[PDB]
Design a protein around this nucleic acid. Sequence first.
DNA 1: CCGAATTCG
DNA 2: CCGAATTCG
Lengths: 250, 249
Amino acid sequence: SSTISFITWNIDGLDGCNLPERARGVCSCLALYSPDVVFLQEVIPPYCAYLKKRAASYTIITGNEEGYFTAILLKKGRVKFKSQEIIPFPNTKMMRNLLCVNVSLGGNEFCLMTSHLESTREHSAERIRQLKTVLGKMQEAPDSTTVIFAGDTNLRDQEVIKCGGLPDNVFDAWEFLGKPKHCQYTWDTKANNNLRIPAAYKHRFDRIFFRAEEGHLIPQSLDLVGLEKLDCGRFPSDHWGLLCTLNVVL
Amino acid sequence: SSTISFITWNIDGLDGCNLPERARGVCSCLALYSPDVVFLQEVIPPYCAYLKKRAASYTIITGNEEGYFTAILLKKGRVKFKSQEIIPFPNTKMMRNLLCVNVSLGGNEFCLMTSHLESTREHSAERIRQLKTVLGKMQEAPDSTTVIFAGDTNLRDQEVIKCGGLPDNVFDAWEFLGKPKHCQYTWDTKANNNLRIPAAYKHRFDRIFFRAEEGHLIPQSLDLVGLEKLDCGRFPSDHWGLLCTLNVV
DNA sequence: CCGAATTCG
DNA sequence: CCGAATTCG
Ligand SMILES: [Cl-]
């Protein structure tokens, strides 16, 4: 159809506690909403094998297969793969990179990108550099393609200003939708207890950027996912996922 | 004569390596110089027990004797113990406090004080707060008493000023003597390799303060001690000790 | 007990 | 993955 949906979610593979139950929890949300595309960050090789069993309707494209890495799942029978590419971050100290996957979906071409930009306050400078590399590659991507970036940016609002703000042709879907409160904070230690942080902190670490011809890609909605606590008393991740549906015109 | 000698020394009881060798090293130094008073910091309970045997010419005054603590040793037949008192550092996160011992020596009354102020650069604020309490208690001691503080202040450059500088009647013994360079740094990872720190860092962490009436107390000398590396290949401590002699008028 | 990398409630 | 506490060369 002329509508596309995706989920972007850091699933926190580096937290070994209750990982099998949490992976099952993630696959529940995927079965519940059945998006066309999933962007995952912090995947580990075991977590990746759990997906090939309980999310078998997706094709997994990965940015590595050692340590922790990102992945882009493509719904079989709805998305067809064309090619992939991994742009390195030459100065990452956390093995971060940029995963790019070109696909066809509903008859239109798409360049799907995800990344897990450098983490923590103390790495603000490298995180800004990596953001520039991502936005640069979004603009350099073929004129004929629609580009969607979804990932764990680890950004603070101050750092996007320090960086020059988003280009005029790259849109933040949450911003486009009017900065709605219900899905602002994707990482919230008051509503989420997985990390056992006593203090309350909230951030909009997880973001969706797109580049399209005027009026060709129109966000319709943004919602948190992974809100249901599991049988073990913990959520699937310390992040909430973002579920986005967009209309494609023409 | 009308002279007092003392040593102050963080002996790093928290470094487990070669602690028996090192405690033997500390006692051998104390016996070469045989000061009237010794202020020790980072003593632990087996280190303290060791001292009560091999340093039997000294009375050991302590506080809780739990965890790591400070002690003050008083040479028998020279210093007469009178009382002791422990002032807390209410906001310390490192079990630090101010040990005070009142003694009679050569006929004069002394209030000897030691402490191991909060460590690391991150805890600058609590360190300065503890310093104010120490200077506080030096001010409030009876006027006829000579007050000598000696301990591991962990103070950096600028931290004493940001605190408001020393009172007018409290002198730093190293400053009084003209800031001699021969004993400026008491913690020097270039000259002392116990901690195995690659980089070179130097600090005057160990300091002597005294309050005395005009011309009543004059520093004569101040020297480093613990400079001889031991058979095991390390130093008694990662700190040099300070040996000080003062004349009393 | 430096301070950068790591742990942890 | 916050940010104070710990670690270790
Ligand atoms: Cl719930």
